[PDB]
């Protein structure tokens, strides 16, 4: 029983999903297959990550086969860099869209805060009033070039998924969002096992208590947050360990504890560092 958070344009979108960043193009079908029998629904991917067309040919077996239909489930992708403009993002959501086989896209994010993205978002806006997908949002926008799309466009972003985990917690950031009506979404929810997360005697004291693993733990503290989470595995078992956290509930204590933790930056880089902008526009 996975709960589905609303929409600033009514859509559901699932709280808890299926990331496949740093998933081998040719290990993606099997595994989004997997997850998808398992239960996953929301699927996180993009251009990027090389494995939309694996992505897509999951999908497809788990339809023709009747495991769900494709309004149950909730395919997320992002425009590259490389590609944002105006005709530019067009076509590379139309590519996206072939890639995965589908007839729509449930969510269509700006990958990265670079480039012309006045542009990109205005291609965006014309491609959801067509109905070709179904929400449109963003990634790695701070809250000054949330503002800088909104006062400038109709469409207020659905979702900006942004890091966040116990060690880059942005509860200032996730205020700024419920505000303004743009929903958070946790990429990285496990720091990408970074600092040795999984081994916290903080989060381990509080996953004794209540029979569950910290991985466990870390997701319902962010779903309970009211923050959309995609943990990523390639392993069966943590596919149903990841999505079965709903049975119980952490107390305000548990998660006061849990907010100590916040170091207020970054696991990897700051997007507002110079030098990371042009490392992330040379990558293509
Ligand atoms: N928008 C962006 O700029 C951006 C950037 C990065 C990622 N993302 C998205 O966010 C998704 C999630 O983030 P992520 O892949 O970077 O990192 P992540 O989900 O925080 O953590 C990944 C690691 O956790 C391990 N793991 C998963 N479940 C576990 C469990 N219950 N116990 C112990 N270890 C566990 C995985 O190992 P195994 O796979 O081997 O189990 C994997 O090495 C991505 O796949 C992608 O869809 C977006």
Request: with cysteine.
């Amino acid at each position: 029983q996975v709960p589905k958070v609303t929409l600033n344009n009514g859509v559901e979108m699932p709280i808890l999903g299926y990331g496949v960043f740093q998933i081998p193009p040719e290990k993606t079908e099997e595994c989004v297959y997997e997850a998808i029998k398992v239960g996953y629904r929301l699927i996180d991917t993009a251009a990027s990550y090389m494995n939309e067309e694996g992505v897509g040919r999951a999908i497809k077996r788990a339809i023709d086969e009747g495991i769900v239909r494709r309004e149950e489930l909730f395919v997320t992708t992002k425009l590259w860099v490389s590609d944002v403009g105006y005709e530019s993002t067009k076509k590379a959501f139309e590519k996206s869209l072939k890639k995965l086989q589908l007839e729509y896209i449930d969510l269509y994010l700006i990958h990265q805060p670079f480039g012309d993205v006045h542009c990109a978002w205005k291609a965006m806006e014309e491609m959801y009033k067509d109905g070709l997908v179904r929400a449109i949002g963003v990634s790695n926008f701070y809250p000054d070039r949330l503002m800088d799309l909104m006062v400038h466009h109709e469409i207020v972003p659905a979702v900006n998924q942004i890091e966040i985990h116990p060690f880059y917690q942005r509860q200032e950031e996730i205020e700024f969002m419920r505000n303004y009506n743009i929903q958070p979404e946790a990429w990285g929810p496990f720091a990408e096992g970074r600092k040795n997360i999984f081994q916290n005697g903080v989060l381990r004291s509080i996953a004794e208590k209540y029979g569950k693993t910290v991985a466990q733990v870390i997701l319902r503290w962010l779903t309970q947050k009211g923050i959309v989470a995609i943990p990523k595995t390639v392993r069966r078992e943590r596919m149903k360990e990841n999505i079965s956290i709903f049975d119980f509930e952490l107390t305000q204590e548990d998660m006061e504890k849990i907010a100590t933790l916040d170091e207020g930056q970054s696991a990897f880089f700051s997007h507002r560092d110079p030098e990371v902008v042009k490392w992330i526009c040379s990558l293509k």
